[PDB]
C-alpha cells in the first residue's frame, strides 16, 4: 500500500471536486467526499489518504459553521447598502441593514461545510464597522464640532 | 464526601471564600487557593466521614461577556463613533469592576487593548491580561446629525 497526506482548502472540502494526492513513491486525483473532516483518513481502493485542511485566515471554523468578518464603511453601517464578501462557495453580494453595528450577524443558511447527517452548516458574517485608513477629515471635522 | 461549587470569574480572582454544601447536609467554608481552575477538585482531609474525606470541585460559570484563553480574558468594548474617531474615556466592566479605559484615536474594530494584571491568577504568581477588543456601535435611537451627514456623500 501507499500512505500520504494532502492540504485542501475550506472551499475545497465543500466542493468535493477532484484533488491531487503524492505519494511517497511518486505516484492520483481523488474525489472529495461530501463530509471531510480535518485529519479525516481515506481507504482508496486499488491502492491511506489523510486530509488536512489548508489554513484560511479569514474564515474560522465552529464546528462546521463558517465564521467570517466583513470590514464595513462607516456610511454604509448607518445608511445599509449592498457589499460583496469573500465567501467558500465564492464572492457573494450581501445586504447590510440600516443603523447595523459590529454587533450585527447576517445568518446565511447551508453556506458551511456539510453535516455528516446531511444538508450544510451555516455561515455567519459579522459585520466590523472600519475607518478608511489616510483619514475622512470630513467626518474627522463633523465629529470634532459636536 | 462529594459537592460542586459554582464560582464566578470574579471570585476565581478573588480568591474569597466560598460555601460548600454536602448531600448530608454539612456545610464547609473553603478559602479558594490563589489559582483555580475549572474542574479544580481540594481535598479536605478528615471532613467526609464517609474515616473520609470531604471533596469539592470548582467549576467557572459561563459567563458570556469573557471569554478565556488560558489565563487571559477578552471582552468586546462598545465604543461611539465619535470616541472611536476622536479617542475618549469608554467605561468597561471587567473582573475587577467597572473601570475606565482609554480609546486611542482612530481606533477602529479589529483594534484590540492591553489591559496588564486583569485577567485571572497565573499559576506561578501575578495575572494574566485583559484584552479589550474595540467594537463602534451606533446608537439605538439615532444621532440624525450624522445621519444627515454621510447620506450627503
Ligand atoms: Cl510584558
Redesign the interface.
Known sequence: DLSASIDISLSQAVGAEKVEAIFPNGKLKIKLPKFVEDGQTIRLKGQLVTIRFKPHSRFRLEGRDVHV?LPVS??D???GGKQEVETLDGRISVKIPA?????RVLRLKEKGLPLKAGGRGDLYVHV????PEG??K???D???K?
Open positions: 468578518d462607516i456610511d453601517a448607518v445608511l443603523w447595523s453595528s459590529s454587533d466590523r464597522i472600519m475607518l483619514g475622512d470630513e467626518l474627522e463633523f465629529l470634532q459636536r
